[PDB]
Symmetry: C3
Subunit: 124 residues, 3 copies
């Protein structure tokens, strides 16, 4: 019953720039970018932030640029595991740094990053 934090990031996939065709292709695109930026930060701080990535669409007003029925998006989540990181604040600052880097590399005008309290049970 370790009290910790989870994050959730939502990003567009910018098909106008990366020209991905399917949701598997955009999932792999975002996953590859996260894999690179997470490793780069891990080399600097010894904190590796893994991410679960999920296909999704995001529904907003068509006048703001949303396609009918929703924009293709990826949801990234993760959770601070005390077996891997000993400082929750540093982990949180790392997630924020990665979220801003993801926004930049995905060429997104906006991005959301949330933190939620969670109780993590890790079975090994």
């Amino acid at each position: 019953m370790g009290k910790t934090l989870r994050f959730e990031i939502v990003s567009g996939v910018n098909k106008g720039y990366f020209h991905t065709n399917s949701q598997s292709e955009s999932l792999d695109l975002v996953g590859g970018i996260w894999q690179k930026i997470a490793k780069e930060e891990f080399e600097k701080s010894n904190i590796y932030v893994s991410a679960v990535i999920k296909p999704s669409k995001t529904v907003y007003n068509q006048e703001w640029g949303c396609p009918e029925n929703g924009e293709e998006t990826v949801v990234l989540t993760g959770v601070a595991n005390e077996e891997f990181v000993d400082d929750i604040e540093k982990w949180k600052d790392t997630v924020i740094k990665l979220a801003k880097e993801l926004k930049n590399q995905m060429k997104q005008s906006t991005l959301t990053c949330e933190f939620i309290e969670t109780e993590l049970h890790y079975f090994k």
Copy 2:
């Protein structure tokens, strides 16, 4: 950035809408949400966006769950203070929209959860 997020789980009612794939039912729910969100936005100036995800929900087959699980859609959202000036009013709007979604999807039941969250919005 302390705020609220919601999560709604809905069936896709294949027998009523006659969709044939997870992608089609995702777009069905997306279109319904897009319409009810716009309709409410016109009445109150509050627009509730939703992230929608494909899913399968597993429960007891004795209660009607299909062998391979029920095709469902998960909808989530979060109150951003840049777009809504009162979180409680936003929460009440989400509840209203969830009940509308339940009715439009012809669902017998629906869950709508609220979770405390800290939102960081980069622009």
Copy 3:
């Protein structure tokens, strides 16, 4: 309606079940969940349903992650007072199911989280 939700993340072990697509992985994991949930329901009269979502999980390639991520499934659920009287007993049941799922999926590790939530159930 203050309560708890769970989230479990599991690998899908394509190298033990010979599967490929994400829809096929949802069906494999959903079938396992149906069976273990029913088994626990018979013992405790607590049935834990699950919403299952397709995903990939990104971690260091040096630790065995494929480039761009490993195929995974995310399972979530929520304790509903209409179906369970004691949230502590529900939580212990979820933990038992999570450990059983880890074994059935032949996974070296598994995460199970509990998050405070406010559930609105419309029926």
